[PDB]
Design a protein around this ligand. Structure first.
Ligand SMILES: CC(=O)N[C@H]1[C@H](O[C@@H]2[C@@H](OC[C@H]3O[C@H](O)[C@@H](O)[C@@H](O[C@H]4O[C@H](CO)[C@@H](O)[C@H](O)[C@@H]4O[C@@H]4O[C@H](CO)[C@@H](O)[C@H](O)[C@H]4NC(C)=O)[C@@H]3O)O[C@H](CO)[C@@H](O)[C@@H]2O)O[C@H](CO)[C@@H](O)[C@@H]1O
Ligand SMILES: CC(=O)N[C@H]1[C@H](O[C@@H]2[C@@H](OC[C@H]3O[C@H](O)[C@@H](O)[C@@H](O[C@H]4O[C@H](CO)[C@@H](O)[C@H](O)[C@@H]4O[C@@H]4O[C@H](CO)[C@@H](O)[C@H](O)[C@H]4NC(C)=O)[C@@H]3O)O[C@H](CO)[C@@H](O)[C@@H]2O)O[C@H](CO)[C@@H](O)[C@@H]1O
Ligand SMILES: CC(=O)N[C@H]1[C@H](O[C@@H]2[C@@H](OC[C@H]3O[C@H](O)[C@@H](O)[C@@H](O[C@H]4O[C@H](CO)[C@@H](O)[C@H](O)[C@@H]4O[C@@H]4O[C@H](CO)[C@@H](O)[C@H](O)[C@H]4NC(C)=O)[C@@H]3O)O[C@H](CO)[C@@H](O)[C@@H]2O)O[C@H](CO)[C@@H](O)[C@@H]1O
Ligand SMILES: CC(=O)N[C@H]1[C@H](O[C@@H]2[C@@H](OC[C@H]3O[C@H](O)[C@@H](O)[C@@H](O[C@H]4O[C@H](CO)[C@@H](O)[C@H](O)[C@@H]4O[C@@H]4O[C@H](CO)[C@@H](O)[C@H](O)[C@H]4NC(C)=O)[C@@H]3O)O[C@H](CO)[C@@H](O)[C@@H]2O)O[C@H](CO)[C@@H](O)[C@@H]1O
Ligand SMILES: CC(=O)N[C@H]1[C@H](O[C@@H]2[C@@H](OC[C@H]3O[C@H](O)[C@@H](O)[C@@H](O[C@H]4O[C@H](CO)[C@@H](O)[C@H](O)[C@@H]4O[C@@H]4O[C@H](CO)[C@@H](O)[C@H](O)[C@H]4NC(C)=O)[C@@H]3O)O[C@H](CO)[C@@H](O)[C@@H]2O)O[C@H](CO)[C@@H](O)[C@@H]1O
Ligand code: CA
Ligand code: CA
Ligand code: CA
Ligand code: CA
Ligand code: CA
Ligand code: CA
Ligand code: CA
Ligand code: CA
Ligand code: CA
Ligand code: CA
Ligand code: CA
Ligand code: CA
Ligand code: CA
Ligand code: CA
Ligand code: CA
Ligand code: CA
Ligand code: CA
Ligand code: CA
Ligand code: CA
Ligand code: CA
Ligand code: CA
Ligand code: CA
Ligand code: CA
Ligand code: CA
Ligand code: CA
Ligand code: CA
Ligand code: CA
Ligand code: CA
Ligand code: CA
Ligand code: CA
Lengths: 128, 128, 127, 128, 128, 128, 128, 132, 128, 128
């Protein structure tokens, strides 16, 4: 079903890292094992993820950014951020303070931060 | 050198679990991948391990216990607890309050706790 | 992918100086081309860089120091030195003999040395 | 032969201050009377000077430093420190502990210390 | 103000000798440069001087003796020992043991000692 | 006069090892052939030995330590380290960094290091 | 209130030894009378001790060390060194020159010296 | 001789008080005035090292007498003195960012952070030691 | 009503310390201010107190112990431990593990611990 | 054999005070521990005691005075002072200057000083 020590959720497998890497570095790592920097597809999936971070209080990268075009948030799979996800941003976010182009789970919601900072991350890939 | 996302350290590879299991279920968990509930061999390893645990703010099992003979602490690989390690016990520990036969990393040093408790754990195995 | 004559490794481009500068002037220099005195983020990157220095038979500065607080090493970007990386110090280091607050690649590992010395250096910057 | 209260020794005059100034300030204080922070030119001079300090147990500055080039000790008159003077350093000196660039008479030999500290000093100049 | 390396205090310059001489050679010494073996006036001057020597860990002569009249103490110039000053003698002085007719600074107070002994001295003179 | 491939110098035979052992092992190793971890008795000897080390730039053990009394360097034959040998320590040595109680030829002089570290060594015995 | 000859100070009794022992032996010594190598816990107390030591002109051990982790000072009762207490180190201390892992009252402040040295010591324990 | 009042901390000629209650920046300033003290104005690196650690070990965010209230971007101590360039290294990474308008300084972990002045936080009072 | 920075609660003034001392050093501390190391008299008081420590998550001393008579817990004011309060100990407490004769607030309840350990403390006294 | 921190020397145990008491008060102090202010009975003993006061440079009382009969020295136990010992007085002692009727170890020998002065002291008694 899911690789050793990965967590199963609705037909998908997730891996909450223990190391901290910058955003692009997080991507090549999920790459190595055939997974993707978690792209959130549904409210249910988001609650589950947000809880994985919330419960351990770790800042975690997700596969969402506005690197290509400031203000225009897009998932690593290319799908644009849906208006129905705005609610997930923490108050005042995304504020792009000092140029923040990457989304992370922070507190009970999301925050945009500098993509060069080292954070925990989550990989995702289809279950067996 | 090491399996994906394991930490390489002085000839060995270490894995910090994301899940929490009681002591015994951890032992069997490490076997599933040809590893073992961490057994500390050197002072240098203790410093490394203790710090990683402390940094992660997580209580973590180590492959040590006095289950077989109260007061007598023995590693899972058989080797006995040397006197040069007794120093790593937290102040007052081991206390066996409520009958604690398994060892964990607690803050600055070691602590004995109930084996039935689910905690994070660490697997160890030699590098390639 | 990488500026002219820079090496490309796991998403980043490293530059091995041919000049020798003191630790500080080695930082100001990577700042002249939007680069940073190499900060080792992973073990594989450490192995790569160690090999680079070792085979060139050169003593080279990395972006690490304990100038701010003796005995507490920090990378030039603020990040702290992880517990696992301490295995890279050469046997006996860091010893601070003669007051050493800057790190370098020496043989198979790291060594603290006087920051006033001119050594080779390595810049780093994302692809 | 020597200014009132100065001391004579081998065609030269020496002034042992009763006040304590930092290294650089000791240097200017000597020029004020056309003298130079003691630059040692011979073994006998060293014995004599070292003895002017041991008798009173006073840590005293001399015209020697490595301020310009760490580890490169040179006298104020610009001449380099001779390998034959290596023997005067106290055991373990110079050790630049916390950055020490100025030499002083300490105990039976020399020690390097912080140039900004106040110490006694000795001026030297030719006798009439 | 004061000459090169002479300490200043209440409109007067004081010189702490680097050499030791007997009481008489000391007076003559101060006269060489038209000065006098320090004669105290105030109580601060005393506190000042007593400190100047207590610090330098040196027994120092002063212009006070009972040479011309055992039991009767007069200053080099002519003034006499005042009842207020008599509190400055250390516990149990002057004792005149072995015939002591000259006063020196000793620890926190004064002591009478043999005038033939070579000790450090202090000259005094008019400021600017 | 001397064994095969040993060096002769002023009535003595010297053997530069090929292996690297800790300090005590080097000691026991020299006895197995009736020699001794080199104890230096004269300046000429010291220059001869230092050269045998400088040539190939190899760190080498000598029968000298301060294991018994820190700061008190003693040769293994029992004789104390004469003050006239002080000049042989490299600059800043002996510094006991991390507790170094064994002496080795290092570069152009001597240095103290950890006795548990394996290095080359030299044996001494009189000629035939 | 206090055993014979011990000194009372703010609820506790202190014993200044007349004998000199190395750090460790000093620790055991205090234990034989149910006391402990003085662990300072207040500015007023630090002043009390620094004075006794200073005035008695004796270098004295206190129950403080960085033997466990270089650069990290800890009292023998396991407690850590408070931030405000770093002001008590003599200028330039701690320097660890020659490898110094034990604290001693030295003059106006504290200095780290080699634990193998014999020095005087101070025991502490509560009054009655 | 008690260089400092009961339960106050003596450090290099001064007395310090780590509060147990939380107050907005202004209420803290006034609070220290009650006992003849002042919201901690830092004068040296060592004082800074001392205070930063006290704050960290206590796991509490704590106000210091510094702000850019009167002039955004320009920081000043409550005693009129300006923020010397040598103290800029003390700001945490990315700070002061002024997010949501922040004009008051606090001890946050390893360094300094600007936060909203109305927030209730612990604070530290300072004043010189007694005559003795 | 209450002293500066002290907390008011139904006719009583309480002081939460930021310093940590052993049980006795705390008693003598509340004495310096005519205060008493807190003695609970009511349940509303207890709930209010447990909260102080509960929120700041701090181990805190109280004037309660079984020092005089192991097993017999008596407040510092003399009063006994009403069978009513008993409900406050945490499961398994007091276990007197390794001889614990002092009470402190721990988590949601109480626990006995070693009187020699340094914890935060609370003073108390009637409001003027 | 000897009390804690007491020195053993041929059958007896001696104590060196850290406190300074007048001669009488020094007598009552030794009685309190069933001891007597050191009364020398042999040469060796004396040689050993002089060193004790010689190292520390402390003026130390001994059980010897000529109070009841000026010029006639007797030990506190009664046994009059023998001649052999009289070779221990320092030059010019006893000089009964200002009327001194108590012996003290001073420098390399003995001296008579005022009994009302506070000085260090030694107690004595056999072992077991
Ligand atoms: C501030 C800090 O260093 N934080 C670190 C943290 O450090 C540890 C942490 O421990 C807090 C408590 O965590 C759990 O509740 C327990 O481990 C508890 O210990 C007691 O209870 C366990 C059972 O749950 C016993 O096994 C253990 O021996 C101990 O027993 C109690 O002992 C006392 C005194 O001897 C006795 O009187 C009690 O009766 C007894 N209690 C019971 C139930 O029998 C911990 O107290 O904080 C401590 C400082 O306050 C540290 O010393 C701990 O090491 O560690 C994490 C993870 O490493 C780190 O992220 C954090 O920074
Ligand atoms: C054999 C090999 O792999 N060759 C590699 C080479 O490897 C390194 C090389 O180092 C030789 C010496 O090079 C310089 O002189 C120094 O780095 C020196 O180190 C000492 O001195 C510096 C200061 O100059 C200190 O920072 C350093 O800590 C060390 O100090 C000494 O430390 C000991 C404790 O062990 C102490 O006892 C001494 O008192 C203290 N001395 C002083 C003056 O304070 C080097 O030793 O060879 C070593 C093996 O012999 C290797 O371990 C080194 O890694 O590296 C180059 C560059 O990559 C490569 O070209 C070559 O092939
Ligand atoms: C501790 C301190 O403050 N250190 C100060 C230091 O303090 C003084 C120091 O003096 C110690 C001895 O120094 C010399 O040896 C003498 O001054 C000696 O005094 C005796 O001998 C001289 C003769 O040279 C006499 O002039 C003097 O009166 C005394 O005679 C003796 O008097 C007693 C009466 O009580 C009588 O019983 C004896 O028979 C007689 N003996 C002789 C030889 O005649 C000093 O004792 O330490 C003392 C404490 O032990 C202090 O009290 C002294 O002030 O002073 C220096 C100088 O400034 C300072 O730097 C240092 O810090
Ligand atoms: C006037 C006064 O204060 N008198 C006090 C006296 O004060 C102290 C005294 O110290 C003198 C020396 O005493 C010992 O020899 C040592 O403590 C020495 O310190 C150096 O060496 C030790 C190791 O032996 C080191 O631990 C120490 O850090 C220091 O190391 C040297 O440090 C310098 C940098 O500062 C460095 O350049 C050297 O390389 C290094 N030396 C070595 C070998 O590594 C003392 O200096 O006098 C000093 C006057 O300046 C005071 O500052 C001292 O506090 O204390 C006594 C006892 O309480 C008191 O009675 C007296 O009144
Ligand atoms: C792990 C550790 O060191 N623990 C220390 C702890 O360290 C500090 C702690 O901070 C956690 C968060 O605490 C508060 O929520 C805030 O201070 C928050 O900072 C953000 O929010 C405040 C306002 O709420 C802003 O003023 C501040 O600038 C920051 O803003 C955010 O900034 C990012 C850019 O970096 C931007 O993208 C966001 O949009 C923006 N958010 C908002 C709401 O505007 C803290 O993050 O842990 C941090 C490490 O994760 C440390 O850096 C902190 O120093 O400190 C305590 C107390 O000293 C200590 O006990 C503990 O050991
Ligand atoms: Ca952008
Ligand atoms: Ca952006
Ligand atoms: Ca943001
Ligand atoms: Ca059991
Ligand atoms: Ca058990
Ligand atoms: Ca336990
Ligand atoms: Ca440094
Ligand atoms: Ca350093
Ligand atoms: Ca080094
Ligand atoms: Ca320098
Ligand atoms: Ca230098
Ligand atoms: Ca030095
Ligand atoms: Ca006369
Ligand atoms: Ca006279
Ligand atoms: Ca006299
Ligand atoms: Ca040693
Ligand atoms: Ca050594
Ligand atoms: Ca060395
Ligand atoms: Ca050490
Ligand atoms: Ca140390
Ligand atoms: Ca030191
Ligand atoms: Ca603003
Ligand atoms: Ca602002
Ligand atoms: Ca901020
Ligand atoms: Ca009990
Ligand atoms: Ca109990
Ligand atoms: Ca308990
Ligand atoms: Ca008489
Ligand atoms: Ca008499
Ligand atoms: Ca006398």
């Amino acid at each position: 079903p899911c690789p050793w020590e990965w967590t199963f959720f609705q037909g998908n497998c997730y891996f909450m890292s223990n190391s901290q890497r910058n955003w692009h570095d997080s991507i090549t790592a999920c790459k190595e094992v055939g997974a993707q920097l978690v792209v959130i597809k549904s409210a249910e999936e988001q609650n589950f993820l947000q809880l994985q971070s919330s419960r351990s209080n770790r800042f975690t990268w997700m596969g969402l950014s506005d690197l290509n075009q400031e203000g225009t948030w897009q998932w690593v799979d290319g799908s644009p951020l849906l208006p129905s996800f705005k609610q997930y941003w923490n108050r005042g976010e995304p504020n792009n303070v000092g140029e923040e182009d990457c989304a992370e789970f922070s507190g009970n919601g999301w925050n945009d931060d500098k993509c060069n900072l080292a954070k925990f991350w989550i990989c995702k890939k289809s279950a067996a």
